[PDB]
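Run log // design_07
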């Protein structure tokens, strides 16, 4: 198809991350544009299924999603994307710039993810792996949803982010995505800490089933934690939409916490 490109048009430069798929490099494309490239290693993952990520990226275009640019479908295999200068949200949150983030910038970042996910929502897709590690940060604190490896049109998984019904019964929906967004809201409010501190996977599964939910993070306003609790409702279906989350987050400091004053950490 028309996404395909020749190898030579590219050039890889700096290396960025490593996984059991391959590598991630920064680079330039047609020697004029700054790009990012997700390599494969000598056929370590199934070739047809590896490009099933980009297959999905092809049909999604939104300002708050990492934009596909090009593909080299002929071995050695690649996937080329827009470049996100500030790396992953998880690294950002716990790194050196992370400590000066306050509630208004963190709420603004949540708003953007929600805006990106609301688009997924109206496109009838499911992300399946929504979390801080899967969001990229650009310049001006812009945040975009990434790592569509598992995204599906609506037709193991780290239970700490994954809704109960999806971890147990493989029932992934946009509403399981909502659940992960609730956990993503805790990573934002704690500068990037792992949820369910000191709890191990099976401890998390057993406790969540019995209705345990993480408490208000320190200095997080109750109204933001209430939103978290809504996202973690037992019935997938009583959970709010992204569209609602987007709108509630964008308007937060006027409609919900107009009395917010900056604290020690948030």
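design_07 sequence
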């Amino acid at each position: 198809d028309a996404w395909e490109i020749p190898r030579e048009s590219l050039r890889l430069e700096v290396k960025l991350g490593q996984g059991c798929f391959g590598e991630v490099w920064m680079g330039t494309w047609n020697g004029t544009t700054r790009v990012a490239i997700k390599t494969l290693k000598p056929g370590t993952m199934s070739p047809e299924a590896f490009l099933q990520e980009a297959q999905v990226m092809k049909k999604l275009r939104h300002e708050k999603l990492v934009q596909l640019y090009a593909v080299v479908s002929e071995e050695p295999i690649y996937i080329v994307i827009e470049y996100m200068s500030k790396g992953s949200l998880l690294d950002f949150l716990k790194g050196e710039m992370g400590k000066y983030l306050r509630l208004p910038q963190l709420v603004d970042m949540a708003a953007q993810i929600a805006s990106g996910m609301a688009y997924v929502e109206r496109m009838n897709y499911v992300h399946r792996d929504l979390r801080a590690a899967n969001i990229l940060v650009g310049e001006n604190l812009v945040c975009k949803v990434a790592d569509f490896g598992l995204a599906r049109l609506i037709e193991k998984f780290p239970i700490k982010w994954t809704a109960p019904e999806a971890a147990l019964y493989g029932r992934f929906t946009i509403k399981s995505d909502v659940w992960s967004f609730g956990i993503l809201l805790t990573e934002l409010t704690t500068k990037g800490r792992v949820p369910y501190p000191g709890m191990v996977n099976r401890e998390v599964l057993d406790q969540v089933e019995r209705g345990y939910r993480m408490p208000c993070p320190p200095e997080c306003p109750e109204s933001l934690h209430d939103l978290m609790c809504q996202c973690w409702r037992k019935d997938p279906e009583e959970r709010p939409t992204f569209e609602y989350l987007q709108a509630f987050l964008e308007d937060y400091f006027t409609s919900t916490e107009p009395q917010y004053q900056p604290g020690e950490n948030l």
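The domain at 84-259 is CATH 1.10.510.10 (Transferase(Phosphotransferase); domain 1).
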